[PDB]
Amino acid sequence: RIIQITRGDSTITSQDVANAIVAYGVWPHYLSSKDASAIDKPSQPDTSSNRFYTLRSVTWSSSSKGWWWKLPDALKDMGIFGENMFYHYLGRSGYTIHVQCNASKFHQGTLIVALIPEHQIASALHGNVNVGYNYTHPGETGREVKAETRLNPDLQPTEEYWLNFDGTLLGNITIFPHQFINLRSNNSATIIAPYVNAVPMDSMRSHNNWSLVIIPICPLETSSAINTIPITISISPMCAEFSGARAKRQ
């Protein structure tokens, strides 16, 4: 019923949880001498990167509809992991995702935390339109579900959470690695994911292997004074690897 995770110089705890789930059931690990293509000695920053990085908390209220960050990226400023990420062309990693969010025996709500591989969103417009880089690489902030016009907005991803942002129905979202946070029960979710992608290593900049999604499937109701609780996200890379080292790109 309890839990304690350690990574690098960091350690999470949680007095009450639903026993962490392992992505597709395959613990992370380094790159096999039998698969790699990169023919140069990979760098493994170790404890200085495979640590726990905590994001920028967002707020959940009686009207929020959802959020999401893409991985890697989101970490692009988090120390060495961040740096390395740009100093090299190729990178590979799997991580541990701990989503915390306490409340009270006098609340009620329910969030769906889902980790998704190759999450290709769809712009919210008709005709030949795509999505703009800048909008799918927010950063530690994330992208919120806001209903109220944007900018050079035709490069904007749709704002239709209930369709998982892609033409599928939330409700089949479970087919991916996911946990549920149900205030009346737990108060934190935890996902550990290996490296998934059809190639040894990929470019940390031009592609986000994953994509974290959180959707309140159940209205956050209460009678208490606090009717707005924060939701925090902490992430820790595992077995980080970089190749093709050169200059830092901007």
Binding site: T11, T13, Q15, T59, G79, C101, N102, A225, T232
Partner: protein, 177 residues
């Protein structure tokens, strides 16, 4: 608070919705405010020290009150962290209050030399900042504030040397018989 128990606890607010600093302190065992503590006072009797420190925290709010803090240790060589991000990039622990009130975490001994001075100068051994990971939360009809205590002790690691006279206690003018 200076001369009352209230100096020993801290106060958490149910009205703070954001990454706010709560408190912090230098590490150097013989520094302020550690110096007045058991370990502290004694360390103050020697000159050099070395080891890991064990910081424990106990939440005292109501039984239905819940929270999620973040005790963090930022290695010397820099400056006190101003933001949460800036802080958690070091050694830390996301502590979630639930049933067990306590939670101990450790300040690894991470120095250049093997030993360090009890009485520092301008030098430091890092700081321990503490922030709001989530937010204190309560139900209806409950004290919007909660207390948070803090203990310290040395690990199996810890150790002192170089006997010298304590500085945390003096005698100005004779004592009556």
């Amino acid at each position: 608070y200076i001369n009352s128990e209230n100096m020993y606890s801290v106060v958490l607010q149910s009205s703070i919705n954001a990454p706010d600093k709560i408190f912090s302190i230098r590490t150097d065992v013989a520094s302020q405010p550690l110096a007045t503590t058991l370990i502290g006072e004694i360390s103050s009797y020697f000159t050099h020290w070395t080891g890991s420190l064990r910081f424990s925290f106990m939440f005292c709010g109501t039984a239905n009150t819940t929270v999620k803090l973040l005790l963090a240790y930022t290695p010397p060589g820099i400056a006190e962290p101003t933001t949460r991000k800036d802080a958690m990039l070091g050694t830390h622990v996301i502590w979630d209050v639930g049933l067990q009130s306590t939670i101990s975490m450790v300040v690894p001994w991470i120095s250049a030399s093997h030993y360090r001075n009890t009485s520092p100068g301008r030098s430091t051994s890092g700081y321990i900042t503490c922030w709001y990971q989530t937010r204190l939360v309560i139900p209806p009809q409950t004290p919007p504030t909660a207390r948070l205590l803090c203990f310290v002790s040395g690990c199996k690691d810890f150790c002192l040397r170089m006997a010298r006279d304590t500085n945390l206690h003096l005698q100005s003018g004779a004592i009556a018989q």
